Write a protein that binds this ligand. Structure first.
Ligand SMILES: O=C(O)CNC(=O)C(=O)O
Ligand SMILES: O=C(O)CNC(=O)C(=O)O
Ligand SMILES: [Zn+2]
Ligand SMILES: [Zn+2]
Lengths: 18, 349, 349, 18
């Protein structure tokens, strides 16, 4: 599951300490 | 000629729309900033148009003209909002330049030589309007951009307006596309000429225009190579390093190959900005103040079975993770670059 | 001058040793190939010398002169081995050049444009000696290098010799350093002039010289930058791309900064080649045939708590893993390079 | 344990199908 580990994403957007 | 046909398709946001009741051209070409790259129109469609459904499904930008998404918010101006938006704090960015480059304040510890070109000040809404009125009559050069997630503290009338949003339509979009939760609604109130430089977000976005006009220039995830984002540990993570007003072709040669999709959104328009799509957003020159509310949704989860070849956005996800893992493993984000270089030089390049 | 003092310390394998009973110089300078880089002597020590213990502990090369490791094997020659080594198959590499570059046959599927400069043929030991005798009197140019893991099929006298090895000393080294199991003993029988080009191994090595003389040129793990190994998915993974006889400074600029540690080992010498250390091994020109048996041990496990800053070999481990993970995630090893380049260009370089 | 995953090593040496 290295492939799955590399494909995972965050939820980062342009909004401070969110 | 394919070259002449190419220059025909590179028509930008195209012929400016006519407002109802013969109220003249909505905007004109002289209000648009000039850049070095060609652009193609983003489709401007009815929500009931099957093509629009197809574009959202395929994660391609589309402007929907008749969603009624923020219909009750179309009456919003500075006076109405100051009266109703509450006594909460609002993040107001201030700059001397027209460009408002976002910076992660949590990442500034890794990069001490980084000096922000804009400042964040927390203030009340009447203070923002006062500071706005102050600059306007003084003839100042200072620019402001209010950027605040809408929260608990909004008054009863804003809550009522919020309830009147087209939740039916958007809940169905969220449902059909398999997206996660709505994470926030960002209120954006900018001055004429304000620019948010090219960047991508890691969430799906329905970008609902309320007041004034914004020119939105988008680039597909496969143009990562042309856009040169900052290192992941940099405060400007996800933003292009290229100065669009003066592009450094020595440092950024493939910016010469960049091709955008553009549109101008006005009141009532909704632009779908697909997750991982680069977007450059500018409030038209001499167009007055602009108001936008976005709807940010977490993307659909990683599919059970992986298909090949990989999509552009998956390779972006991958590169981001490699940068993060290296930062953690090396114990120092500053070491990521030297290791990456050592890895490729005379080996892969 | 530090420059003059530097040229003094760059003394290579140094003054050639005198063999007992005034039997003349063991070897001379004209038997050594000429290269473009400076070298420092590897310490040549008694096993009971505390410095030697300190060097092995710190994973630095040392030549031990009196281990008696393969004492019973010192009587080995072609005749004795042909008589006693059994009816098993032996891997014999054949080349037209002096360089015997190892290639992983399992990885050749990824790299179809790769054509090996040497060939592996499985034969009996008497066939190797016959093929060796054949070339010698015919005055041929073909070079052979027998390279075979010693197995079950060896005869009773080789087994008896094996039992007489200094297992006490080496078992204690294995124990003290926290290494894993002995994985193999590689028998190496080469022709005069044969060269094994610079590479590193992912195991600890006690390199026991039996017949003839080998010049061993070693480079520390922190010289990864100067040595340019092939991509991990290449058949020549772990080997330097630099041709030591004609170095391409355009492609490999930091090879101009490379500094080796060298020694000449003869019968009875044991060279500790630490895991991840680059080594270039050459059988001396006009020195006759050479015989070596190595002892390959799995390295000690990753420590419970990680310490910073990282050691050079840990960063090598890291880079290898990044290359492997990318190969797997992209579903295609050929895609690793393009992704890595995209990741650094105008971002980290 | 990403750090531990990146620091792990194989046992590759110059010997065919080993
Ligand atoms: O509207 C702007 O100036 C910037 N907005 C965004 O980047 C967004 O909604 O994702
Ligand atoms: O002796 C040689 O020619 C090559 N030997 C090795 O690379 C080794 O023992 O690790
Ligand atoms: Zn954005
Ligand atoms: Zn080796």
């Amino acid at each position: 599951e290295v492939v799955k580990l590399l494909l995972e994403h965050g939820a980062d957007v342009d909004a401070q300490d969110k | 000629m394919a070259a002449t046909a190419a220059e025909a398709v590179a028509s930008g946001s195209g012929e400016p729309r006519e407002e109802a009741g013969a109220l003249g051209p909505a905007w004109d070409e002289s209000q648009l900033r000039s850049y070095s790259f060609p652009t193609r129109p983003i489709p401007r469609l009815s929500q009931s148009d099957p093509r629009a459904e197809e574009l959202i499904e395929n994660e391609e930008p589309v402007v929907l003209t008749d969603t009624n998404l923020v219909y009750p918010a179309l009456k919003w101006d500075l006076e109405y909002l100051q009266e109703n938006i509450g006594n909460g704090d609002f993040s107001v960015y201030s700059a001397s330049t027209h460009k408002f480059l976002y910076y992660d304040e949590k990442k500034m510890a890794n990069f001490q030589n980084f000096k922000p070109r804009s400042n964040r000040e927390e203030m009340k809404f009447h203070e923002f309007v006062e500071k706005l009125q102050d600059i306007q009559q003084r003839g100042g050069e200072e620019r402001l951009y209010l950027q605040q997630t809408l929260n608990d503290t909004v008054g009863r009338k804003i809550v009522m307006d919020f309830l009147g949003f087209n939740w039916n339509w958007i809940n169905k979009q969220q449902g059909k596309r398999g997206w996660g939760q709505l994470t926030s609604n960002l209120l954006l109130i900018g001055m004429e000429g304000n620019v948010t430089p090219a960047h991508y977000d890691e969430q799906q976005n329905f970008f609902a225009q309320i007041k004034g006009y914004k020119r939105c220039i988008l680039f597909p995830p496969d143009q990562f190579e042309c856009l040169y984002p900052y290192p992941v540990h940099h405060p400007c993570d996800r933003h292009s390093q290229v100065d669009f007003d003066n592009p450094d072709y020595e440092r950024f040669p493939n910016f010469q190959n960049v091709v955008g999709y553009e549109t101008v959104v006005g009141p009532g328009d909704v632009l779908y900005i697909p997750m991982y799509w680069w977007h450059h957003i500018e409030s038209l020159l001499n167009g007055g103040i602009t108001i936008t509310v976005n709807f940010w949704y977490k993307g659909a989860p990683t599919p059970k079975r992986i298909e090949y070849p990989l999509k552009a956005h998956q390779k972006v996800a991958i590169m981001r993770n490699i940068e993060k893992m290296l930062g953690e493993a090396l114990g120092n984000p500053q070491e990521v670059g030297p290791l990456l270089n050592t890895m490729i030089k005379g080996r892969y390049n």
